[PDB]
Amino acid sequence: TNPKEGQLATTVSVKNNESTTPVRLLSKDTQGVEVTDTVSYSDLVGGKVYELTGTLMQIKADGSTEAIASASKEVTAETSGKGTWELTFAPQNLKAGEKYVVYEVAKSKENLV
């Protein structure tokens, strides 16, 4: 497999919130938030197992981040190398007037390079 092969597109969602790109929360709806991240993947080695790790980052005004939550899952790429994975973070207390972003990394269980 070409080391450069592979794409992850991610869409974050919050339970019982309909907003997207970005998700918007009222200050009252910040306690025990259930964040899902939908990972659309393409050009992964079909039928191979990946360690999918998502990271909920607090993004400060100066562009630096601090990780507040993380979730990892053994997943399998569809045989076509395209498909979808879902990831949900443990319940999180978020802060009013703050901005959060989700990172995603997929590493194959096997050495495919």
Partner: peptide
């Protein structure tokens, strides 16, 4: 091969990946 296949999406400005809290 000697290493793992690593695909990352780590874009701090991706709106799709962003939650904004009001107040």
């Amino acid at each position: 091969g000697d290493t793992k296949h690593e695909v990352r999406h780590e874009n701090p400005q991706d709106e799709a990946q962003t939650i904004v809290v009001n107040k």
